[PDB]
Amino acid sequence: SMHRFLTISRLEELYNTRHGPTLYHLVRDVKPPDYRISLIDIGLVIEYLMGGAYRCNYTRKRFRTLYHNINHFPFPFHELMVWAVLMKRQKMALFFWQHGEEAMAKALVACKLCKAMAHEADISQELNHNSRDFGQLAVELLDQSYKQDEQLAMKLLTYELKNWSNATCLQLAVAAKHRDFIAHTCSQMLLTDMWMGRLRMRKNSGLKVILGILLPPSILSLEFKNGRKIYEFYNAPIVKFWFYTLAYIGYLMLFNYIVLVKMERWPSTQEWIVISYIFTLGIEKMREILMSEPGKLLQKVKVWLQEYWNVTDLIAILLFSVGMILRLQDQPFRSDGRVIYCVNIIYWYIRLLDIFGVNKYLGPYVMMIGKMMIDMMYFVIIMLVVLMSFGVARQAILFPNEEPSWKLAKNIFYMPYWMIYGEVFKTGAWIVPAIMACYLLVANILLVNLLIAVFNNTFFEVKSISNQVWKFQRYQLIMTFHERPVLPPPLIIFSHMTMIFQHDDELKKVHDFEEQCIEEYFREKDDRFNSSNDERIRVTSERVENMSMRLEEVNEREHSMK
């Protein structure tokens, strides 16, 4: 009995043993040669590898305190599989996964662990195979469960796991970035149901949401079927998304009207509205960070800072506040400070790109731009190397008598078309500049055509995958907007006030269903493999050889009998 066999001392000895086929180095980095490894350190390194905002049942201070002070793991298979994947023992991990509770959750964790170990660190080989194999197994298990029962598969996809720090399968898949799992039909159906919220409407959803936002009192009553109806309509994430979009458009229009016209000693009403917008957004950001409690206050910001867009937003807010402060510093400083928050507008116009990835037909363009930014960066070096040489040569040939005056960069970088063409059309002094002009003119068009071809190839390569990639971001967007309150950014100031004012048989059935699903998967795999033509041909050949040999031997007996 593994349950009876399992014990703290035995597991510690197993972990600390070196009699077998990167655990030591990784533990040392996370944490002393031949140091006695305990469950606490193993859990700590596990949490390190999983990522931020994660937890492990064994990897906790209370568990460490208990260990320091039955002693049987209720689910030994989980720890055994975690160890097996930790020490890079694949067949044993497969066997353990063959018999275990909540196999899908463990499989996704293994895929996450394999990828994380590969990135931290044969390393390439295991990354390509081990992590991919675990992900494929999870996908196959999901597919079988959906075939057996759609409702039960949907229920299994989302439910709190006490063992794994209460993280659903979807969250683990997203953390592992396994696009295949999310792309499955059941996952997309669940995401669409979540996005539509309580309302079941599925035809002309955008127009219906726009009408509901425009005409609450009349639209909401009818839209509820497709009081409490208005409240549940508001709480849906889609209407929140449209509300935020409209508020952002209004903010953009006010910002355009403010900076573009005039300035006075005291700001106008529109500038006050914009300042209120930014103040409320800052309050919302601070609240969101505050609710990001896991890891305590000190270790909450570190995880929250992973996203780049959030950091850019903070930087933009700081620059806007600095510009506003400088504005109210008399005319000499007002004129100097206006430009800063005039330039600040650029960030807000570009922030819509991160929101333009939601649409099916719009995200490919953003992905292509992101891909081609680096290509343009590299192309710039070649462009400079080619053009600057000829420009410098042409400039040197002309203006034989000259003084630096820090004014040659403009002359070399001018690169005019009409002027060069005219310059194209004693004798040698005229011939050489013509040759230089012709070479520059040819090089310009050569580079232009090269850039065109580069962009075409990059766009084709991006488009070959953008459709598959698009589906992943939907879960992030939906889980992001769903958590956010219902009021727009300028009106959530009251929302915070309301927030402050406010302050087992099914499990057994699911376990049985999972066991049945895995048994059926193994049976189907074995039957399909045994029914393969290649295997059957081999079996027939071996049987024929033995049958022929027996017949030949029997022939001698028949002759002797006669």
Ligand X SMILES: CCCCCCCC/C=C\CCCCCCCC(=O)O[C@H](COC(=O)CCCCCCCCCCCCCCC)COP(=O)(O)OCCN
Segment 243-282, which members bind ligand A8W (CB under 6 A)? 253, 256-257, 260
410 binds ligand A8W (CB under 6 A): no
CB of 274 to ligand A8W, least distance (A): 13
Q: Which is closer to ligand X, CB of 294 or CB of 370?
A: 370
CB of 167 to ligand X, least distance (A): 25
Chain breaks in the chain (C to N over 2.5 A) after: 21, 31, 69, 121, 226, 425, 503
**Is residue 52 classed as helix, strand or coil in its secondary structure?**
coil
Distance CA 19, CA 21 (A): 7
Q: Which is closer to ligand X, CB of 230 or CB of 367?
A: 367
Count residues near its own copies (CB under 8 A): 91
CA distances from residue 57 to 39, 41, 44, 299, 551 in whole angstroms, order as listed? 11, 13, 11, 19, 66
Q: Which is closer to its own copies, CB of 158 or CB of 457?
A: 457
319 binds ligand X (CB under 6 A): no
Q: Annotate 426-440 with three-state secondary structure.
A: CHHHHHHHHHHHHHH
CA distances from residue 208 to 190, 219, 227 in whole angstroms, order as listed? 21, 8, 19
CB 457 within 8 A of CB 443: no
Choosing from 281, 283, 451, 479, the residue that interacts with ligand A1AIB (CB under 6 A) is 281
Residue 436's Cβ-count burial label (10 Å; 0-12, 13-18, 19+) is: buried
Choosing from 51, 74, 370, 416, the residue that interacts with ligand X (CB under 6 A) is 370
Q: Which is closer to ligand A8W, CB of 257 or CB of 460?
A: 257
Looking at 42-50, 202-210, 257-265, 302-310, which segment touches its own copies (CB under 8 A)? 257-265
| Residue type at 400 in one-letter notation | P
CB 188 within 8 A of CB 471: yes
Cα 41 from chain centroid (whole Å): 29
489 binds ligand A1AIB (CB under 6 A): yes
Q: Which is closer to ligand A1AIB, CB of 347 or CB of 513?
A: 347
Tell the residue number behind the tokens 């820090």, with chain if given. Answer: 406
265 binds its own copies (CB under 8 A): no
214 binds its own copies (CB under 8 A): no
DSSP 6: -
Q: Which is closer to ligand X, CB of 353 or CB of 408?
A: 353
Annotated binding-site residue? 361: yes
CB 437 within 8 A of CB 424: yes
Q: Which is closer to ligand A8W, CB of 408 or CB of 469?
A: 408
Cα 434 from chain centroid (whole Å): 55
x/- contact string, 434-453, with its own copies (CB under 8 A)? ------------x--xxxxx
Choosing from 25, 129, 463, 525, the residue that interacts with its own copies (CB under 8 A) is 463
CB 67 within 8 A of CB 8: yes
CB of 414 to ligand A8W, least distance (A): 13
Annotated binding-site residue? 360: yes
As a whole number of angstroms, the longest Cα–Cα distance in the chain is 129
CB of 430 to ligand A8W, least distance (A): 17
Q: Which is closer to ligand X, CB of 2 or CB of 452?
A: 452
Please, which residues have CB within 8 angstroms of residue 176's CB and are 6 or more apart in sequence? 108, 111, 112, 115, 135
Distance CA 354, CA 477 (A): 10
Looking at 119-127, 234-242, 363-371, 506-514, which segment touches ligand X (CB under 6 A)? 363-371
> Could you tell me what percentage of the chain is helix, strand and coil, using 3-state DSSP and rounding each to the nearest 5?
75, 0, 25
Q: Which is closer to ligand A1AIB, CB of 251 or CB of 390?
A: 251
Q: Which is closer to ligand A8W, CB of 5 or CB of 413?
A: 413
Residue 104's Cβ-count burial label (10 Å; 0-12, 13-18, 19+) is: buried
335 binds its own copies (CB under 8 A): yes
x/- contact string, 486-525, with ligand A8W (CB under 6 A)? ----------------------------------------
Residue 401 binds: one of ligand X, ligand A8W, its own copies, none (C-beta under 5 to 8 A by kind): its own copies
408 binds ligand A8W (CB under 6 A): yes
DSSP 203: S
Computed from CA positions of residues 221, 222, 225, 230, in that sequence, does the dihedral angle turn out positive or negative? Answer: negative
Looking at 62-70, 233-241, 291-299, 362-370, which segment touches ligand X (CB under 6 A)? 362-370
537 binds its own copies (CB under 8 A): yes
Residue 245 binds: one of ligand A1AIB, its own copies, ligand A8W, none (C-beta under 5 to 8 A by kind): ligand A1AIB
Tell the residue number behind the tokens 């290509």, with chain if given. Answer: 375
From 306, 312, 304, 311, select the one nearest 350 (Cα to Cα): 312
Residue 528 binds: one of its own copies, ligand A8W, ligand X, none (C-beta under 5 to 8 A by kind): none
Question: CA angle, corner 350, sides to 344 and 355, nearest 5?
Answer: 135
Residue 284 binds: one of ligand X, ligand A8W, ligand A1AIB, none (C-beta under 5 to 8 A by kind): ligand A1AIB
Tell the residue number behind the tokens 């600390």, with chain if given. Answer: 16
Count residues near ligand A1AIB (CB under 6 A): 13
Residue 318 binds: one of ligand X, its own copies, ligand A1AIB, none (C-beta under 5 to 8 A by kind): none
Distance CA 333, CA 198 (A): 53
12 binds ligand A1AIB (CB under 6 A): no
Please, which residues have CB within 8 angstroms of residue 470's CB and are 6 or more apart in sequence? 357, 360, 363, 364
- Residues of the shown chain interacting with ligand A8W in the complex, contacts defined by CB under 6 A: 253, 256-257, 260, 404, 406, 408
Q: Mark the binding-site residues, compressed into ranges.
A: 205, 360-361
Which chain residues interact with ligand X by CB under 6 A?
308-309, 350, 353, 366, 369-370, 373, 386, 439, 442-443, 446
